[PDB]
Amino acid sequence: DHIKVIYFNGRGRAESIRMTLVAAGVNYEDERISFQDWPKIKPTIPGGRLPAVKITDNHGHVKWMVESLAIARYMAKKHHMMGGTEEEYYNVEKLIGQAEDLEHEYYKTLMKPEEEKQKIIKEILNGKVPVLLDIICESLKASTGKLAVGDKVTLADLVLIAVIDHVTDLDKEFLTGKYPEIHKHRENLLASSPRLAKYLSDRAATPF
Amino acid sequence: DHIKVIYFNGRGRAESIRMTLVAAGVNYEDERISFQDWPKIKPTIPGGRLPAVKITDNHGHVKWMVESLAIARYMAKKHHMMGGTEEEYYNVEKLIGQAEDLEHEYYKTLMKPEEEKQKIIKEILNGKVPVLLDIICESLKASTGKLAVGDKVTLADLVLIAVIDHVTDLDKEFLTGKYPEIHKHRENLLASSPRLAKYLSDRAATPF
Numbered sequence: 557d558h559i560k561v562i563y564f565n566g567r568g569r570a571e572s573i574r575m576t577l578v579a580a581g582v583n584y585e586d587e588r589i590s591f592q593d594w595p596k597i598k599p600t601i602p603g604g605r606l607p608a609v610k611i612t613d614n615h616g617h618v619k620w621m622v623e624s625l626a627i628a629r630y631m632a633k634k635h636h637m638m639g640g641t642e643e644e645y646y647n648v649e650k651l652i653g654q655a656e657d658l659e660h661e662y663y664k665t666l667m668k669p670e671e672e673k674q675k676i677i678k679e680i681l682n683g684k685v686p687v688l689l690d691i692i693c694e695s696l697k698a699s700t701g702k703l704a705v706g707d708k709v710t711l712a713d714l715v716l717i718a719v720i721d722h723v724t725d726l727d728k729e730f731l732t733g734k735y736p737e738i739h740k741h742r743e744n745l746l747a748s749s750p751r752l753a754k755y756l757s758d759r760a761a762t763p764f
Numbered sequence: 765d766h767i768k769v770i771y772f773n774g775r776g777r778a779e780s781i782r783m784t785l786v787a788a789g790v791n792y793e794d795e796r797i798s799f800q801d802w803p804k805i806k807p808t809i810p811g812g813r814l815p816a817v818k819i820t821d822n823h824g825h826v827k828w829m830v831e832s833l834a835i836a837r838y839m840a841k842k843h844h845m846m847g848g849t850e851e852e853y854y855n856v857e858k859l860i861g862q863a864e865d866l867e868h869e870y871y872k873t874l875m876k877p878e879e880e881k882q883k884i885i886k887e888i889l890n891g892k893v894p895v896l897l898d899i900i901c902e903s904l905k906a907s908t909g910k911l912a913v914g915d916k917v918t919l920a921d922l923v924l925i926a927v928i929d930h931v932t933d934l935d936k937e938f939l940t941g942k943y944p945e946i947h948k949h950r951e952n953l954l955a956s957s958p959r960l961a962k963y964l965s966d967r968a969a970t971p972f
């Protein structure tokens with residue numbers, strides 16, 4: 557199958573999908589649409605938003621997929637990255653929920669002029685961000701393995717590292733000297749997944 | 765097992781859990797904490813946030829669960845409300861993702877000075893809200909059955925109707941004469957689920 561992931565030139569909502577396929581060892585075309593080209597591409601995209609995933613089989617079937625974490629969950633499930641048990645499934649989802657909460661704190665700072673971007677950054681870093689990071693640390697501590705849930709890679713591992721990257725975007729040193737579970741998680745995840753480690757080495761700094 | 769759902773006196777994040785259990789025919793204790801009582805209750809809750817679900821079996825085991833849609837997804841999966849195939853699973857998740865987007869637009873109106881609140885409402889109802897409602901309508905249109913995904917109730921059905929209630933909280937007539945798929949969905953859902961229809965009739969009015 558040809559898998560084409562369509563997004564803007566950034567991590568954003570597409571990163572969960574990219575990382576899932578990378579971790580699973582699945583090849584895909586990573587298509588990045590410039591903001592200038594978006595107006596003409598927009599009508600060709602079912603639903604008119606990105607991420608969109610276009611899957612073509614070798615018998616001409618074209619499957620369109622939207623909603624990033626729905627796609628990632630689908631792909632993760634196909635490749636046994638959503639839990640081995642109902643209990644592991646819950647814990648995978650618990651961490652995705654906690655990480656998405658954090659992602660939505662980070663979203664408040666976006667599309668805002670420098671001025672109030674900084675006021676909002678200070679607000680969330682003094683409030684909900686540390687609250688959510690501790691909660692994430694508690695989830696990680698409760699794992700029976702090296703990773704988020706057990707010893708094998710799940711979607712929770714991937715969702716977590718992408719949102720931490722957004723947190724460090726707001727403040728490079730926010731986790732420095734703190735949240736030992738989150739640091740230890742990223743190192744165990746990179747150790748367990750040479751594919752992901754190489755992927756992360758090869759991208760390709762983006763502002764979002 | 766005894767299931768106690770702990771939340772504030774409101775729909776909010778607990779409603780997905782309540783509806784899941786109600787739809788599945790699972791009995792639970794619905795515990796509502798006053799805002800005044802919260803400071804003494806808070807330290808007794810693992811992670812110090814609501815909703816939290818405390819489960820006690822007949823052999824003294826206490827299982828604590830946090831993160832509402834992780835909990836809902838867990839219960840939904842136990843009771844075959846997350847799709848019967850990988851494709852249905854994707855579609856369930858696609859609708860949850862779209863409905864949660866809408867919910868987060870609604871969240872921007874909260875904890876805001878009373879007008880303030882009104883300018884945000886006007887921003888989102890002229891912006892992202894109709895965008896997402898249409899996207900949700902396209903998802904509903906693509907179902908093979910009378911409900912969100914097929915013919916039997918899934919978590920997507922329940923997540924959708926809760927978020928629509930938040931939209932009508934902002935503006936009661938926003939879907940009047942519009943979004944035929946959403947109205948038809950609620951109608952088919954209550955017909956398919958007398959338990960849920962009963963539950964929504966007996967539910968006391970709540971501001972959030």
Ligand SMILES: CCCCCCSC[C@H](NC(=O)CC[C@H]([NH3+])C(=O)O)C(=O)NCC(=O)O
Pocket residue numbers: 567568569598604605606607622623624625764861862865
């Ligand atoms: C770090 C940045 C992340 C902010 C989220 C925006 S992704 C860009 C946007 N798409 C969405 O908001 C889709 C959100 C959806 N919940 C998903 O994850 O797929 C879009 O196509 N917008 C262009 C358009 O609407 O025309």
Ligand SMILES: CCCCCCSC[C@H](NC(=O)CC[C@H]([NH3+])C(=O)O)C(=O)NCC(=O)O
Pocket residue numbers: 653654657775776777806812813814815830831832833874972
């Ligand atoms: C309709 C708006 C309500 C939706 C968000 C508020 S739920 C109340 C809040 N908890 C959360 O934000 C949990 C969010 C988490 N993502 C979940 O879904 O469980 C809390 O316990 N806060 C009390 C505290 O932190 O002390």
